Amino acid sequence: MKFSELWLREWVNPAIDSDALANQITMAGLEVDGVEPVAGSFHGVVVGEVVECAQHPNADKLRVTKVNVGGDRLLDIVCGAPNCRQGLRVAVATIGAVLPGDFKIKAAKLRGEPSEGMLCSFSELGISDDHSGIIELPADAPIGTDIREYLKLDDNTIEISVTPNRADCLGIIGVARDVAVLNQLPLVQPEIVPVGATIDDTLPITVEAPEACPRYLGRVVKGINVKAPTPLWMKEKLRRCGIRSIDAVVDVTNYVLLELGQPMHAFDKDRIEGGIVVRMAKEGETLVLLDGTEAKLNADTLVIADHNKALAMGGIFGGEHSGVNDETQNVLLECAFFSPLSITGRARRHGLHTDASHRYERGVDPALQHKAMERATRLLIDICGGEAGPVIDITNEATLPKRATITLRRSKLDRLIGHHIADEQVTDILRRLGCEVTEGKDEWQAVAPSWRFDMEIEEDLVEEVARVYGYNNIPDEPVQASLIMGTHREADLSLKRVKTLLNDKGYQEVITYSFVDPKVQQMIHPGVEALLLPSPISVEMSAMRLSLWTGLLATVVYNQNRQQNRVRIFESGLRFVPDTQAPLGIRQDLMLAGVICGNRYEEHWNLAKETVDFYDLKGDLESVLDLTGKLNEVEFRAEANPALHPGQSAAIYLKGERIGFVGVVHPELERKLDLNGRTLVFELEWNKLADRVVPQAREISRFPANRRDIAVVVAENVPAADILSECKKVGVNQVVGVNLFDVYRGKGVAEGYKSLAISLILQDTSRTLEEEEIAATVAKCVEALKERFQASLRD
């Protein structure tokens, strides 16, 4: 939580910087993440009494007034924040002081009325949010000293985050004690004197389920003035720990809270029936809470109840009934301990997170109740009226949390830290933390204090020795280990390598949310059932992706809007595709994805300003996939994939099996909110192409080779990949090179047909090839070409 330096220094005061303290607590493992003065800065503001508050008026809502400090000659000031009463001891800025929002106290009449010199209010002094206005001190102030000195204003609230373990740092005491332990110092505790009852024997209080509330303290305190005005010092410790001073009773329970870690709560005896029963709630039993609304309570939820209705959730919250109201006369003080595993779930189940829930869920000291009861009794009758009553202590020997004996080996310690902390300095650090320790040759016996909920095993005990000795001064040594290599495989291909190649073909790497607009990715994949995220940061980010195609087209439009489309992005990461045959319900496959669109190159003097088409992507991935992997085996069969143009779109193969898709997105989907101009897109199943051919040197041949062009006529319904891939098979030993160098159609080629000029290069390792031998082996191809397909003349 938040605490006030000077209240801690009250409990323990090191001789060290304000700044040094903060640094020192943060190395204790609870990170200070805020430090604020409590007020703005100023001088020349002083306590003084108004001895006479003349009328006025002659200006209506204003009182002219003789005020008095110490350095005499009575000071004449004007005021009109309308609670400007006769004898008030008050905070006043004198003729020359300077207030925050740096403005200058001068001397001028106000309405012809006396001149100078403003009486102050909390707001005008940097401690924010107004009461009525005009600060009203508790009488008997130093009738002339600085309000900075009187109101202990050279003080910081200091805000910390406290890790769920070590729940002993949520009152001021625990924190004080931890800081004390650091500076070797002792912890100065306020004198908390038991009150001694003075009224009735009172109140039937049965615990129905003790294991969830071992210890319950109750104390009836009869006839107390509810609208008593919480005295400034308590308004000011409470406010400097981030608590709006609400009330009177409610404030004291808050004060004890912040002071001791203990969560008190008060009731209205005259609304509680036949005693209190501290019990588990019947399943669905409703309870209207301190804020309008009821709650359906599941049968594992402890409630502070009465003899025929429920009053308040167990160490969580209240009742739009059973609390302190306008005619409350008498109260019962709850100060209990609760088993944290009987608090854990519940508050958030209903969406509550109160001070009490919070301390109670990670563990309030089960040796604290009595002491907190006595501070909260003395503090109520001092501030409000009323008198005492017997502390009704209904405890439970057994289910009362049981501290455990830890044994801690000099070895284990040395073997886990790797640095020797002298025997003599570990015993102390342990005892000073709170333990009862018996040193015992190579080991220690430690008994865990009652207030520490995170000391259970040996290792928990070494956190502590390290913690306090100082991480700062545990030395760095590098780990000593064997140098074994681990198993490499030349045949596998790094994605790093592909990312580079990809981005040397001009491609920005991108990272996309793995969950996306479900609405949006239906237009991409038509109602293909997507794994459903019930309760996400957003409706538009609630589907686990099945492509990156969604993440990517989302990412073009993003920049498209920033005026500038010409985007070439790729991404790696997984798709999540529902499968009842997966481990769990989703196929989690690594993927490669990208999209290109707009001008092949940007504005250039000597490069054509053509936009980008299919073969620009095909070449880009023909680069990757391949001559990096293996190639010559892969193939681009044409295929419909709902969300890309059928005529201009292909499935990528690789000996037999789909490894991916590439296409220009389908039209209406481009128009589907998605933006300007034709866009190309591809995805590859990574793991299938994460592996390349390790080479083996193959002879060379010092004979010259021979080129032989062929003009292959063929129906428009025949791939051109296939014709080629068909020549280097009828290939053998050997036509070494096949190459498509032209595609011609129209005049002098049968309509609906098309010619592919093809050039086969023939080479041999044994002999320099014979004029006839050549024509022969082309003829073998040309003939196999009209095996399949047809053949083969002109263009």
Partner: protein, 242 residues
């Protein structure tokens, strides 16, 4: 339009052919990775060397058959052309006191040109010195390296050998159908002479050092018949190592 504007998706896309590295570079790379993860820092030396660093500091010294045995190219009494990347072994050790740990790829030069010899070629020195290092580690680390290198296809041996700057020395010879046995790397424990003249106390530190022929590693692995093909740079040849 969606029919009428179909295209043949098997036509070859546009791109320039890819460009692999040369096979020895490819070998160098693999090795530097292998050793990268054992924490061996990569270190270079000039390829023009003197009578101190090639030879005399490595405890040759002058009247040793070595000078002649490495068919040395001299420029005069003094300047020579690296014979081994064993120079950096001396050069490194003189700049830093141990707990060293380094490779050292470079191109050394000899005077032979043959099916398995060239007037140039490349080597990988490794050095490691610290109060700790032994023969078992030399064997341990090299076995382990060969395993990854070849992946275990090839028939190796690990014999005794002789190097004036180690002792014990060792060679590993690998057989690859020919041939047959090829000298692949050579190694040992750093001769105490060589520790002394370089400023490290032999009584406190020990070290092992090694030097493997890259083109030989490269031949065997991808079975290149002829080491001399590595520098004729036929594109046909290079391109099969894309």
């Amino acid at each position: 339009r969606l029919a009428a504007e179909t295209i043949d998706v098997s036509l070859p896309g546009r791109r320039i052919e890819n460009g692999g590295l040369h096979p020895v570079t490819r070998t160098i790379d693999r090795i530097e990775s292998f050793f990268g993860e054992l924490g061996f820092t990569v270190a270079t030396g000039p390829e023009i060397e003197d009578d101190y660093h090639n030879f005399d500091a490595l405890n040759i010294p002058g009247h040793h058959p070595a000078r002649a045995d490495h068919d040395t190219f001299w420029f005069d009494t003094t300047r020579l052309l690296r014979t081994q990347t064993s120079g950096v072994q001396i050069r490194t050790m003189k700049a830093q006191q141990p707990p060293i740990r380094i490779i050292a790829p470079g191109r050394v030069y000899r005077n032979d040109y043959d099916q398995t010899h060239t007037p140039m070629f490349h080597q990988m020195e490794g050095l490691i010195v610290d109060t700790n290092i032994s023969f078992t580690n030399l064997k341990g680390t090299l076995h382990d390296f060969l395993r990854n290198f070849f992946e275990e296809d090839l028939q190796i041996r690990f014999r005794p050998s002789y190097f004036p700057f180690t002792e014990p020395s060792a060679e590993v010879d690998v057989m690859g159908k020919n041939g047959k046995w090829l000298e692949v790397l050579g190694c040992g424990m750093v001769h105490p002479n060589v520790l002394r003249n370089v400023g490290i106390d032999p009584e406190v530190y020990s070290g092992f050092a090694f030097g493997m022929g890259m083109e030989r590693l490269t031949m065997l692995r991808y079975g290149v018949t002829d080491l001399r093909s590595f520098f004729e740079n036929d594109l046909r040849f290079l391109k099969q190592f894309k």
